[PDB]
Amino acid sequence: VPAVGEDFPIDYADWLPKRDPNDRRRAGILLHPTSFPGPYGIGDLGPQAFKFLDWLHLAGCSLWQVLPLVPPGKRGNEDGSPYSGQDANCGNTLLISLEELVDDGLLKMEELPEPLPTDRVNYSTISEIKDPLITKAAKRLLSSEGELKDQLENFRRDPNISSWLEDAAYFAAIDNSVNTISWYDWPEPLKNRHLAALEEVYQSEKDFIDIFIAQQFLFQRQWKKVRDYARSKGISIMGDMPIYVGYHSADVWANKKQFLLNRKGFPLIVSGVPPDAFSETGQLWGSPLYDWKAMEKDGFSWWVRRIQRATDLFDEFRIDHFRGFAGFWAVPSEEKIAILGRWKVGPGKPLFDAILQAVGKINIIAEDLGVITEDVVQLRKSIEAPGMAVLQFAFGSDAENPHLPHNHEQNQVVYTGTHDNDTIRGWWDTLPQEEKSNVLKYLSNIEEEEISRGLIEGAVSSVARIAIIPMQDVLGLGSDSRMNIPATQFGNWSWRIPSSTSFDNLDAEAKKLRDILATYGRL
Ligand SMILES: [Ca+2]
User: Fold this and answer.
1) For residue 177, how far is its CA from the centre of ligand 1 (angstroms)?
2) Sign of CA dihedral 430, 434, 435, 438
3) How far, in Å, is the centroid of ligand 1 from the Cα of 267?
4) Exposed, middle or buried by CB within 10 Å (0-12, 13-18, 19+), for 109?
5) Residue 223: CATH number of its domain
6) Are 200 and 139 in contact (CB under 8 A)?
């Protein structure tokens, strides 16, 4: 601008305040693809994914949130959990659409199963049905000689892809052959990745490894098609990643020095959270912990690659237990409970500086629920990452509760509830009378019969730049439709949109959402 007191240009009054596109108000729906309806026992990246995206577009939503897309562990009672993944980078092959594979010529229609029970994902039977079909398709692709073969080759050879995929495939092949509970007990040449032993693995387990890679290509291609379609409809996809990875994975076995392990590869300390006046005992998660000191020395290369893959899949993503980047609870690996442990200093902002330098700008959402400390808030603010507000947590304390709308801020993501909460209707049904009174009063004395509308509107009308509603709440569903109960080992991650509900029959629901998005400037 000119010197103080001097003339501005004649057109000064046209220099109107700028609206940063990153600040655009948006609304989204939380719906994990396993929850899509259809005849094959689990939702997939096929015809229903596109019907869903059409419905989202009709509803005026510009975001779709999913849970992690990784292959869930099947080795306990974590049945189907997106948060107990077998690998940090691979896609869940159960999400691969049998119909799209028929379109590709990799499966024959006659090979597809007769329609399976539709109400709920049965994680105990679904792999036995779908795995052989995905394998058949992968084998057909491997023996083919056209455009898809060429694409498979480009995929396998891509330096970003190969940085995790080769290790993931060899890990799975060895796991299949050796079949111990963990790699800690593998024969030393395989445990310690002797060059000759790995060469021998590819010779003896060639087919397994080739098929594993082909399956990951099939996932990649289907996911890309979905993401491209979403983008065509003005819809971004928000993913999710746990801060930690599991011990028995290629992530650890192929990158041992990234983790705090002893000389025999056993974790020295493991993840958890301490007691916070709850049942005397805290929570023992048991994941290996990162050697953040070692990581800083190479510019956080392992974390950079993890982020690269996340951006290959998602437009933006939440990191669970974001507080772990500021401070993390460490339990000696011998302990059977979380009581005995210490808080350790996390990597802080330098991790995010290195990510920025390597990968560029990313919308990372900080999961910041529960008791968090001041350093966590300062870290989050320092990288301009939005935290969370969850309306189902807002009404049981006092007016300073950060989840209450009058306490929201613009750079934040507001939910009615997440996959960890009951549905609005389910939550209401078990809510104590005193809290019910408080909710109704807060929401301008609305009727109990309109609680769902009240909470949905409370989210949409918030100043928070992103509002997310679970699909269950759009559908008016109760506790039988809850995705996860955090205390538990069974019945989780299995909810599906009922067979009788189809996206083409949800025009009324889309209009109802679109109208409030219009009113509250999210359209
Ligand atoms: Ca096994």
Assistant:
1) 9
2) positive
3) 20
4) exposed
5) 3.20.20.80
6) no
Q: Tokens for 198?
A: 């790995």
What distance in angstroms lies between residue 357's CA and the mean position of ligand 1's atoms? 40
Q: How far is CA 36 from CA 45, 102, 147, in A?
A: 9, 19, 29
Residue numbers of the domain that contains 279: 21-523
Closest listed residue to residue 273, CA positions, set 160, 182, 370, 357: 370
Residues 260, 290: contact at Cβ < 8 Å? yes
What total of structural domains would you count in the chain? 1
Compute the distance from residue 320 Cα to the ligand 1 centre, in Å: 28
E strands present in 428-512: 466-470
Backbone angles phi, psi at 258, to 5 degrees: -80, -10
Q: Residue count of the chain, please give it.
A: 523
14 in any annotated domain:
no
Whole-number Å distance, alpha carbon 327 to ligand 1 midpoint, is: 34
Q: Contact at 8 Å (CB) between 41 and 129?
A: yes
**H helices present in 443-523, as ranges:** 451-460, 471-474, 507-519
Cα 15 from Cα 135, distance rounded (Å): 61
Please state, in angstroms and as integers, the Cα–Cα distance from residue 515 to each residue in 110, 347, 454, following that order. 45, 44, 14
Look at residue 16 and tell me if it is in a domain.
no
Distant-in-sequence, close-in-space partners of 221: CB < 8 Å, separation ≥ 6: 151
Burial 57-77 (b: 16+ CB within 10 A, else e): bbbbbbbbbbbbbbbbbeeee
Distance from the alpha carbon of residue 76 to the mean position of ligand 1, in angstroms = 11
Method: X-ray
Give the CA distances from residue 343 to residues 271, 337, 418, in Å, rounded to whole numbers and listed in that order.
10, 15, 27
The CA 363 to ligand 1 mean position distance, Å, reads 37
| Resolution to 1 decimal place, in Å | 1.8
Question: Looking at the domain assignment, is residue 2 inside a domain?
Answer: no
Which amino acid is it at 35? S
> Which residue is listed with tokens 């079909």?
133
Residue 32 CB contacts under 8 Å (≥ 6 apart), including other chains:
43, 66, 67, 82, 419, 483, 493
**172 Cα–ligand 1 center, Å:** 10
What is the C-alpha separation between 73 and 149, in angstroms, rounded?
A: 29
Report d(CA 96, CA 268) in Å as an integer.
38
The answer to the question of residue 6 being in a domain is no
Of residues 466, 482, 430, 481, the one with CA closest to residue 451: 430
Work out whether strand 327-332 and strand 342-345 pair parallel, antiparallel, or are unpaired.
antiparallel
* Closest to 66 in 3D by CA, of 179, 181, 276, 230: 230
Buried b (16+ CB within 10 A) or exposed e, 170-190: bbbbbbeeeeeebbbebeeeb
Q: Which residues are known to be catalytic?
A: 320, 367, 420
Is there a contact between 282 and 211 (Cβ–Cβ < 8 Å)?
A: no
